[PDB]
Amino acid sequence: AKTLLHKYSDIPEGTECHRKAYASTSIGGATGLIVSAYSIALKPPASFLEGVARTGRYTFTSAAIGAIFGLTSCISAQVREKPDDPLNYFIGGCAGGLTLGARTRSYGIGAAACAYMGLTAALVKMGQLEGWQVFAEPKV
Amino acid sequence: PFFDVQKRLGLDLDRWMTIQSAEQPHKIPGRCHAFEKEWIECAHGIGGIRAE
Amino acid sequence: ARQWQPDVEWAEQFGGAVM
């Protein structure tokens, strides 16, 4: 629900890293359940225990990514104490890929995931700073 | 493309079935005819947007 | 230098039900 992202949105700044990290963990878990849902839907696992194995995989992975992203971001905020510039998320962004790199046990995918996930996060922060509309209202 | 040919030709072939009031057989009242009537009389040149 | 126009082994790759 939007109320959940709204929950994560009230960081504030980066204070209480745990409070934030729990929320990011929540979002990562949500997306993990969705991806698991379509995956099961479109790739009939055969033998249902394997299916819950699959969903356990994705759910735990995405939840992990969200957790580590959130807490590295807030910690960087509470350490560099810059704390508002976009790069402050980027480390976590770069960190996130490595998490993804760990479960996949591959340097390659982890390496790429570092860079792109990093840039995406950086753009997100930059967007919060700039009020980018992504889905702008018809206005015109 | 809401062509409104039925209006330009005046056929009205569809329009009658619309709305709670709008002449019904044996003039049977709608259960909520009044609030509806007022509310539609409120609605004309205001058109859609300011109307809400 | 007689141009180059595609060979059989070339064309076969499209010949599958799905590239």
Partner: protein, 347 residues
Amino acid sequence: MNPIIYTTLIMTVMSGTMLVMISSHWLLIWIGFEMNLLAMIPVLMKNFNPRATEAATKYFLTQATASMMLMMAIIINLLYSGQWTITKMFNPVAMTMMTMALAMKLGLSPFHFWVPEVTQGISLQAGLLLLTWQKLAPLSVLCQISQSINPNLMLTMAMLSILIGGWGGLNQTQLRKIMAYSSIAHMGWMTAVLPYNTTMTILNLLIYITMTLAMFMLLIHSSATTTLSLSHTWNKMPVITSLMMVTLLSMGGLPPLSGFMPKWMIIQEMTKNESIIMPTLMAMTALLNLYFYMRLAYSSSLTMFPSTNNMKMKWQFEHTKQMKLLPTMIVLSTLVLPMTPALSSLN
């Protein structure tokens, strides 16, 4: 099935859509789609194949469930406002479902999976008609309910239709499935701008229909299907392959060509709304859409796949049963670019 009946079916399809474009009352719209369906299935069943049958099974099954959800959401709208006129809907839980039902009717992703399959199951005549005429009515109602659309929900399917309309297009050989992913991709561009400004939608619609008329008339003219089957045509009647190249590029929207006119008005409109990021992603992916038009161009005109010998006798025999409407459908779908401003005729 003798022409006298076939024509009555196809005319009652035309009627079954015209009815949607006329009536203001909702019930007549749901009747419009409903009559449209019954008259759409049999025409897919001409010639009749063991394959075609399950094609029609797919199409019917999805259209039926779509029409069902639609009628349900109408009834819920009535429950919470007691109206039948189109206008604004008055209950978001209903409105999202009317959006879903229409989302199936256009074949937008992730509801899209039926369209590439169904196209495979029928001849290019019934195919073309399915990819053009069937795209009118649901859009014909979306233009009428643009006023209250929940833009988030619309842009998400509008984008995802473009990504899926891309990635699923790089993969296939036989052309009909590719035409399916082309259309499934353009619908993303139509339904994208719809919340913001319907006139751009209708413009893009006209270009799309003209385009796919160009292609399907050409595929008919050469009776090509699988890509390789298309490859031979360069030697027999070189012109038409030498023209598929161009119409393909107009699908691709290389800017002198007409097919660029849609995108380049769309980018305008959305940009007035700010929303600057979305068109950038969209326009970038449209490239990915272009690429398989290009590869398909490589199989055909630009390069000569080896001919089969048996072709030679066929050289003596001119094609027949000329399709009158074709040349104009090429030309309008290409050269018309310095006639954008005329779009305002659509007000």
